[PDB]
């Protein structure tokens, strides 16, 4: 059912020590090779008062 | 998305199996300086495009820390340990944020992956990962994200052989 | 003894560089029913002998638990997270112990290794282990212990630019 | 200084759950070839009423 | 909402001081099978009815455990420890669920309180609490919820006097 | 002293426990200085809850 | 040693009841920079005189931390949660050591009291503690120590109906 | 059996941070009034190079 390429869309509502935000992502990945890439835009809440690193594993 | 993980025939793949229905996972991230995040994400497949709806709720980070002070660097590569528990796959990791200057900032990561379907279940295994920001704008309103993840057993062969417990 | 850990020449082997003088280390082990162990070890080379010297202290393992009911079979291999701190290689691990039939019982692991001399410090990296009872009497009075350890980097390309 | 064959000896005083024990061992392996072998004797406290695995990455 | 707490004269009241502006607070509940809940709530006043806005996330409870099995009876009473850290007010509690027939499933509560105004700051102090469901269906689609909390110091006077 | 020997309380809760999402709502009264209050709570959604209610009450 | 705690008549007194046989105990202290301590105590009654027999073990106290740097002024008084777990009386407590120059440094406390005689088990209750250094030479070789205790129910009415 | 006025003797062997110490103490109190006083001495390993408070709840 799934192949050498696949598309990615992402919607994250989140919140960190007060600040609410929304992030939307588009990208693709190689499921069978174990990789992917994602362009990430901050809809609501920009600019982030906190390290973006905490987010990345959720995206 | 652990769908995007390489899995040899040796090991069942919990994530590509789950589909067509797909899966859900829950993660807690517990930091070296006592911050915390819980996260939930639903992963579905409609067509060729995985949709990932997520709810990230981070909390309790001290106000003058490397997170709130916006001064971390990246994640280190990592290796997840993964066992079955209550018939779910559970993902355990020791994570490390490099700190601007030299030092680290640290994080246990525990995940419960839950496939909306019965699938063939794996034994204990690892995933080795690497997540990276490849580009961004000034305030990371725009970011470009690269993970890589590959599943294995231990490379160190077993030399025990024949025994009674 | 992280001495007996094969280092590829890309990584500095913090361990074998600490000799002749030696290296000591310090660890804590937290079990998921919060039994808890504190331990210390000194590693002195003489001639060709590494005489390990060890104080070990274990605490509040629950009566009907696996430890007290002896239902472990082994440790799963593991992968240690190695990361220089305050000049000190600190290692971190999610260990787990296979049980008779029933799956696993988990444990966290913090180790710091301290050099008796100035050595060259590595960048962040991992030591795959596997540790194992090759043999034992029924009492464990006599136990043959083996270990395999191999330091690496990440097998994966930082495909970044 | 360290050579393909070296030798090992190990001494461990212990308390676990009140219960005391001593344990001694002598052994061998190959430091550059990162493998180690060891022979262990429980010199005092025997028989050990708790799993031995929880002692072994210390031994 | 700690606005409802009995607070002695000699003990600043972070919560009733924060008004009219009020406050928010943030809570991690750590239960012993590592099920966690994280909470945040904003408490407002205008007129005579405060308003709590609250979000609540709980995950990693074992399916075969006392929450997922609905075998908890209630909380015991408790005492919270409140201290200022990084200019803020924190509270810490050893929490107990009384388990059907006997036993306890325990929890750590850590709360961080954040007033939207600068209020006078209290010293290390305690809060005796007691919370209780009073009326409920078996399904608890209707519930009636009582708490009583009272603030203090330790009732044990010091014998320390003179030192360096 | 804006805050009165008697007061009222409104409460909106949204939440989600091991997946199961829910919206809870209640209204009530308290006595600020006596450290007392009593709340009426109704589940507007997700009823009936699969989880011990107890984990909610100190947040409610 | 509890027994040095005021009990009211309508709380049973786990510790005193325990004599003449006595009772032992075992506690875990988990600090907020993850320094840690294990401890065990036989408390026996020879005549008028209780003998306390203790063993104490602790670890990972970061050299620059306030324990090793001696920057404690004191413990904050506290309030222990007492429950019965599987026959035993388990106490839990949130301790904080008042820092040097303002601030607090926290620690988690779990204690199990294992009586060695049939006693009348209690229901959930609390003990207000205050422990105090009342005198101490400079290097602390000679220290005089005081502790109060009061058994407790809630002083708050159950509106249960 | 236990009485208004009772004596106490204290023996603690311990190690902190690998630093050894034996310490002993003699004291008194009132079991029913909930008080107790204790005179404590460092036997070996004085001076302790760590905050005496970590010890005190034990002693
Ligand atoms: Mg335990
Ligand atoms: Mg030893
Ligand atoms: Mg033990
Ligand atoms: Mg194993
Ligand atoms: Mg022992
Ligand atoms: Mg003394
Ligand atoms: Mg101290």
Residue G107 maps to a domain: yes
How big is the CA angle at A52 (ends A51 and A54), to the nearest 5 degrees? Answer: 85
Domains in chain B: how many in total? 1
Report the SS3 class of residue B135. Answer: strand
Would you state the structure tokens that stand for residue G145, as one six-digit string? 């120590």
The DSSP call for residue E138 is S
Interchain CB contact of F38 with E (< 8 Å): yes
CB contact at 8 A, C136 and C144: yes
Closest of E113, E83, H35, E106 to residue G75, by C-alpha:
E83
List, as ranges, residues with CB under 5 A of the ion ligand 1. Answer: C 33-35, 60
Closest of E43, B156, G56 to residue H48, by C-alpha:
G56
- C-alpha–C-alpha distance, residues B149 and B91, integer Å: 13
Q: Say if residue F55 is exposed, middle or buried (CB neighbours under 10 Å; 0-12, 13-18, 19+).
A: buried
What is chain A's length?
Answer: 59
Where are the alpha helices (H) located in chain A, listed in sequence order?
53-56
Q: Look up tokens 């600090």; give the residue.
A: G31
CB contact at 8 A, D30 and D5: yes
Report the SS3 class of residue E45. Answer: coil
Closest of H50, E81, H27, E37 to residue G57, by C-alpha:
H50
As a dihedral over the C-alpha atoms of residue B15, residue B17, residue B23, residue B29, rounded to 10 degrees, the angle is: -20
Q: CA-CA distances (angstroms) from residue G146 to B88, D42, G128?
A: 52, 43, 14
Residues 23-52 of C with CB under 8 A from B: none
Q: In chain A, after which residues does the backbone break, taking C–N over 2.5 angstroms as a break?
A: none
Please tell me the number of the ligand nearest to residue D17's CA: 3
CB contact at 8 A, E93 and E79: yes
Q: CA-CA distances (angstroms) from residue H38 to C143, G7, G41?
A: 47, 21, 16
Separation of CA C145 from chain center: 14
- C-alpha–C-alpha distance, residues B164 and G145, integer Å: 54
- C-alpha–C-alpha distance, residues C22 and C46, integer Å: 10
Separation of CA E74 from chain center: 15
* Closest approach of C64 to chain G, Cα-based (Å): 11
The neighbour count for residue A19, using CB atoms within 10 Å, is 13
What is chain G's length?
Answer: 161
Cβ-based neighbours of E46, under 8 Å, separated by 6 or more:
none
- Taken in order E82, E85, E88, E91, is the CA torsion positive or negative? negative
β pairing state of E49-59 and F7-17:
parallel
- What phi and psi, each to the nearest 5 degrees, are found at residue E102? 145, 145
- C-alpha–C-alpha distance, residues C151 and C89, integer Å: 13
Residue E103 maps to a domain: yes
Question: Which residues form the domain of B28?
Answer: 14-152
Would you state the structure tokens that stand for residue A28, as one six-digit string? 């693709």
- C-alpha–C-alpha distance, residues F42 and B53, integer Å: 28
Domains in chain D: how many in total? 1
Q: Do C67 and D9 touch (CB under 8 A)?
A: no
Which residues lie across from B81 on neighbouring strands?
B92, B126
Q: Which residues of G touch E77 (CB under 8 A)?
A: 124, 154, 156
Q: Count the helices and strands in chain D (H runs, E runs).
A: 1, 3
CB contact at 8 A, B160 and B154: no
- C-alpha–C-alpha distance, residues C92 and C3, integer Å: 17
Conformation bin of residue B69: beta by default, left when phi > 0, alpha when psi is -120 to 50: alpha
How big is the CA angle at E85 (ends E80 and E90), to the nearest 5 degrees? Answer: 25
Would you state the structure tokens that stand for residue E103, as one six-digit string? 């036993």
CB contact at 8 A, G54 and H10: yes
Closest of C4, C29, C27 to residue C108, by C-alpha:
C29
Q: Look up tokens 């601030």; give the residue.
A: G103
How big is the CA angle at E5 (ends E34 and F27), to the nearest 5 degrees? Answer: 80
- C-alpha–C-alpha distance, residues H5 and H2, integer Å: 8
Would you state the structure tokens that stand for residue F34, as one six-digit string? 């006596």
Q: Say if residue F18 is exposed, middle or buried (CB neighbours under 10 Å; 0-12, 13-18, 19+).
A: buried
Cis peptide bond prior to H41, omega within 30° of 0: no
The DSSP call for residue E6 is B
Resolution reading in Å: 2.1
Q: CA-CA distances (angstroms) from residue B13 to B7, B89, E35?
A: 6, 11, 26
Residue E142 maps to a domain: yes
Cis peptide bond prior to C20, omega within 30° of 0: yes
CB contact at 8 A, G46 and H2: no
Would you state the structure tokens that stand for residue C59, as one six-digit string? 């605490």
Cβ-based neighbours of B84, under 8 Å, separated by 6 or more:
B90, B121, B122, B123, B124, C103
Report the SS3 class of residue B69. Answer: coil
Question: Which residues form the domain of H11?
Answer: 6-56
- C-alpha–C-alpha distance, residues C78 and C127, integer Å: 8
The neighbour count for residue B102, using CB atoms within 10 Å, is 9
Residue F37 maps to a domain: yes
- C-alpha–C-alpha distance, residues C149 and C78, integer Å: 10
As a dihedral over the C-alpha atoms of residue C11, residue C16, residue C21, residue C25, rounded to 10 degrees, the angle is: 80
Q: CA-CA distances (angstroms) from residue C43 to C23, C93, D53, D56, H51?
A: 6, 21, 21, 16, 29
Would you state the structure tokens that stand for residue G2, as one six-digit string? 């509890």
Interchain CB contact of G144 with E (< 8 Å): no
Q: Count the helices and strands in chain G (H runs, E runs).
A: 0, 9
Q: Do C96 and B77 touch (CB under 8 A)?
A: no
Task: Provide the CATH number for the domain around residue G100.
Answer: 2.40.155.10
Report the SS3 class of residue H2. Answer: coil
- C-alpha–C-alpha distance, residues A48 and A12, integer Å: 14
Interior/surface letters D11-45, b for 16+ CB within 10 angstroms, e for the rest: bbbbbbbeeebebebebbbebbebbbbbbbebeeb
Q: Say if residue B10 is exposed, middle or buried (CB neighbours under 10 Å; 0-12, 13-18, 19+).
A: exposed
The DSSP call for residue B118 is -
Of E4, E133, E148, the CB nearest to F32: E4
CB contact at 8 A, C40 and C24: yes
Q: What is the CA radius of gyration of chain A?
A: 13
Q: Look up tokens 């083996």; give the residue.
A: C146
- C-alpha–C-alpha distance, residues B161 and C18, integer Å: 34
CB contact at 8 A, E109 and F57: no
Residue E20 maps to a domain: yes
- What phi and psi, each to the nearest 5 degrees, are found at residue B7? -140, 110
Q: CA-CA distances (angstroms) from residue E76 to E29, E34, E108, F55?
A: 15, 20, 13, 13
Residue C43 maps to a domain: yes
β pairing state of C142-152 and C104-115:
unpaired
Question: Which helix or strand (DSSP H or E) is residue C68 part of?
Answer: helix C66-69
* Closest approach of B147 to chain F, Cα-based (Å): 26
- C-alpha–C-alpha distance, residues B98 and G135, integer Å: 46
Which residues lie across from E149 on neighbouring strands?
E129
Q: Count the helices and strands in chain E (H runs, E runs).
A: 1, 9
Report the SS3 class of residue G9. Answer: coil
Please tell me the number of the ligand nearest to residue C129's CA: 4
Cβ-based neighbours of B125, under 8 Å, separated by 6 or more:
B11, B82, B151, B152, B153
CB contact at 8 A, B44 and B22: yes
The DSSP call for residue G62 is -
Q: Which residue of B has its CA nearest to A40?
A: B143
Residue E26 maps to a domain: yes
- What phi and psi, each to the nearest 5 degrees, are found at residue B164? -135, 130
Question: Which helix or strand (DSSP H or E) is residue E15 part of?
Answer: helix E14-17
- C-alpha–C-alpha distance, residues F38 and F20, integer Å: 26
The DSSP call for residue G125 is E
G103 CA from centroid of ligand 6 (Å): 26
- What phi and psi, each to the nearest 5 degrees, are found at residue B87? 80, 10
Q: Distance between the two ends of chain C, CA-based, in angstroms? A: 38
Q: Which residues of F touch E52 (CB under 8 A)?
A: 9-13
Residue B92 maps to a domain: yes
**Per the annotation, where are the binding residues of A for Mg(2+)?**
54-55, 57
As a dihedral over the C-alpha atoms of residue A45, residue A50, residue A55, residue A59, rounded to 10 degrees, the angle is: 30
- C-alpha–C-alpha distance, residues B44 and A13, integer Å: 17
- What phi and psi, each to the nearest 5 degrees, are found at residue B152? -150, 175
CB contact at 8 A, D50 and C61: yes
Question: Which helix or strand (DSSP H or E) is residue E17 part of?
Answer: helix E14-17
The neighbour count for residue B121, using CB atoms within 10 Å, is 13
Interchain CB contact of F18 with B (< 8 Å): yes
Residue A57 maps to a domain: no
Task: Provide the CATH number for the domain around residue D43.
Answer: 3.30.1300.40
């Amino acid at each position: 059912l799934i192949k050498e390429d696949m598309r990615v869309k992402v919607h994250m509502e989140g919140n960190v020590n007060g600040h609410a935000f929304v992030i939307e992502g588009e990208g693709k990945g190689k499921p069978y090779e174990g990789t992917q890439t994602l362009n990430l835009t901050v809809k609501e809440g920009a600019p982030l008062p906190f390290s973006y690193d905490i987010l990345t594993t959720a995206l | 998305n652990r769908v995007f993980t390489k899995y040899p025939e040796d090991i069942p793949d919990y994530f590509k199996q789950s589909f067509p229905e797909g899966y859900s996972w829950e993660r807690t991230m517990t930091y070296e300086d006592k911050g915390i995040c819980t996260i939930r994400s639903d992963i579905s497949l409609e067509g060729d495009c995985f949709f990932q709806n997520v709810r990230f709720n981070g909390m309790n980070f001290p106000p003058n820390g490397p997170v709130m002070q916006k001064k971390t660097l990246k994640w280190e590569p990592s290796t997840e340990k993964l066992h079955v528990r209550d018939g779910l796959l559970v993902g355990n990791i020791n994570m490390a944020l490099l700190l601007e200057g030299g030092g680290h900032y640290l994080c246990d990561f525990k995940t419960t992956y839950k496939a909306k379907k019965v699938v063939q279940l794996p034994d204990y295994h690892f995933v080795d990962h690497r997540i990276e920001i490849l580009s961004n704008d000034s305030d990371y309103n725009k970011v470009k994200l690269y993970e890589h993840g590959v599943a294995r057993y231990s490379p160190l062969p077993s030399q025990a052989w024949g025994s009674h417990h």
